[PDB]
Design a protein around this ligand. Structure first.
Ligand code: PRO
Ligand code: PRO
Length: 507
């Protein structure tokens, strides 16, 4: 037991074929006895012999035993301290190039244990080039092994942009995604999805992950019984989804997201809405699919259930906004919001306690709902016009006398845009006129921002079809600024300005 020890060292530190080798197959034996190991690591000359012969050997039984020895040692916070003080990490790492399974296995786990409990280990693995070696090991097939490898990477990448970028350069994205769409073993899916989550916040990793088919691979696991796996997939998907606009094969993912809106889980709902919102920005096929599986229905139920939780309603309202314009079934989707009792909650969201990003999104949504003639009347009846006008008036004031991520100039355009559309209905024009908005619309012709000139001239154009309003618009002195705008680089502005002008001088 306790006494006869550094005999076995000398032999390992020897420079001969069988001599050091068969001497290895002994400390291995001795390391296996938990109280005999708890004493073996005390001699740094003994510790270091193990390391050396490991880095420089040729024997499959030799390596196995030296690794295993270190494996077995890495269980005591004294073993760890010893392996560290000795310099195991560069050798262990160097061992990640070996072709003998059981050696890889011992190396990875030892590094894993060091990475978990040993002060200073993360730095030394990076310095040894361990990230690159670990990425290259991702093509293996034993799941316990990949679990441990991906966890090493997670531990190294977390909070370390340098490590994230090296992972990128070694082809991590592709290799981690292949894992997500190949295996079923929860523990490994979960840790891989955590590496991907850590990489998904990096501006360079994100497109690389999206190009490897990340969105679809993460999509595959959204119905797993494991809640931690689903949630991690949801967060990664969300971080990535602004970069995923050009991706195809999105049908299954899109369908599951809609279902997930039904969920009792708040973070589930919040992510599915935020993902659907992003994946539906600009890409009209995505609009099509989400409408096809009942997305309008689901998004409305979600807005109704969220009440005043803006982490939910804001992205759900943004999604609804995307789904209600510029695609083959926009029109059906504009109707459907009304048919599922959406109109009263949408107008409500214009009122406190709603914060600006929500209000902007909601005004945008109302703009689009108004393109549908059968929404004219209920939007009016629900109170949309007076609030829109108040939001317009207040925001124009804030513009003149000089917020929370949104510029009042966008509220001005959004509200004037919505009123432009609402103004196609004759009763709406009466309400808009009664609110004495004409002076404000005329002032908005002088805006520096073209998009504001456009909606202002557009809405005046709608008002000017009624004789009384045409008279009013003239009495505001609209002729002069409309006259300069006939020459706008923006053809939207020029065209409306001539329609208003034409309706005024019919006298
Ligand atoms: O969804 C939520 O929880 C946000 C945060 C405060 C207001 N509503
Ligand atoms: O966000 C706010 O504080 C106010 C409430 C209504 C208009 N904007």
């Amino acid at each position: 037991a306790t006494r006869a020890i550094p005999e076995l060292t000398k032999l390992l530190n020897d420079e001969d074929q069988v001599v050091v080798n068969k001497a290895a197959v002994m400390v291995h034996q001795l390391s296996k006895k938990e109280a005999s190991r708890h004493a073996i690591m005390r001699s740094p000359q003994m510790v270091s012999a193990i390391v050396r012969t490991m880095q420089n050997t040729n024997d499959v039984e030799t390596a196995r035993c030296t690794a295993g020895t270190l494996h077995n040692l890495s269980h005591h916070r004294e073993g760890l301290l010893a392996i560290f003080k000795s310099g195991g990490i560069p050798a262990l790492v160097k061992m990640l190039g070996s072709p003998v399974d059981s050696v890889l296995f011992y190396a990875i786990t030892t590094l894993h244990n060091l990475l978990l409990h040993q002060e200073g280990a993360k730095m030394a693995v990076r310095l040894a080039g361990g990230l690159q070696k670990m990425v290259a090991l991702l093509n293996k097939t034993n799941v316990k092994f990949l679990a441990i490898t991906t966890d090493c990477l997670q531990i190294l990448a977390y909070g370390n942009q340098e490590s994230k970028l090296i992972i990128l350069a070694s082809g991590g994205p592709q290799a981690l995604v292949n894992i997500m769409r190949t295996y079923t073993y929860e523990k490994l899916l979960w840790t891989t999805s955590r590496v991907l989550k850590v990489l998904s916040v990096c501006s360079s990793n994100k497109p690389a992950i999206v190009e490897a088919g990340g969105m679809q691979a993460l999509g595959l696991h959204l119905t797993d019984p494991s809640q931690r796996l689903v949630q991690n997939c949801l967060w990664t998907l969300r971080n990535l989804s602004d970069a995923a606009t050009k991706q195809e094969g999105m049908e299954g993912l899109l369908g599951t997201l809609v279902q997930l809106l039904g969920s009792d889980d708040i973070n589930v709902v919040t992510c599915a809405a935020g993902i659907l919102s992003n994946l539906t920005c600009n890409n009209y096929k995505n609009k099509m699919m989400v409408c096809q599986v009942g997305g309008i229905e689901a998004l409305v139920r979600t807005v109704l259930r969220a009440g005043d939780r803006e982490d939910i309603t804001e992205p759900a309202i943004c999604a609804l906004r995307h789904l209600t314009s510029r695609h083959q079934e926009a029109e059906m989707a504009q109707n459907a919001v009304r048919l599922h009792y959406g109109l009263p909650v949408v107008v409500k969201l214009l009122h406190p306690p709603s914060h600006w990003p929500l209000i902007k999104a909601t005004v945008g949504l109302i703009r689009n709902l108004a393109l549908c003639p059968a929404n004219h009347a209920p939007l009016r009846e629900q109170g949309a016009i007076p609030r829109l006008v108040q939001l317009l008036v207040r925001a124009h004031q804030d513009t003149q006398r000089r917020v929370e991520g949104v510029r009042m100039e966008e509220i001005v355009e959004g509200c004037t845009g919505a009123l432009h559309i609402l103004a196609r209905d004759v009763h709406n024009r009466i309400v808009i006129r009664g609110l004495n908005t004409i002076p404000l619309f005329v002032q908005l012709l002088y805006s520096p921002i073209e998009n504001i000139q456009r909606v202002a001239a557009g809405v005046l154009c709608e008002l000017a079809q009624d004789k009384e309003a045409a008279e009013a618009i003239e009495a505001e002195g609209a002729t002069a600024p409309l006259t300069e705008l006939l020459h706008s680089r923006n053809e939207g502005v020029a065209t409306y300005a001539a329609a208003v002008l034409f309706r005024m001088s019919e006298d």
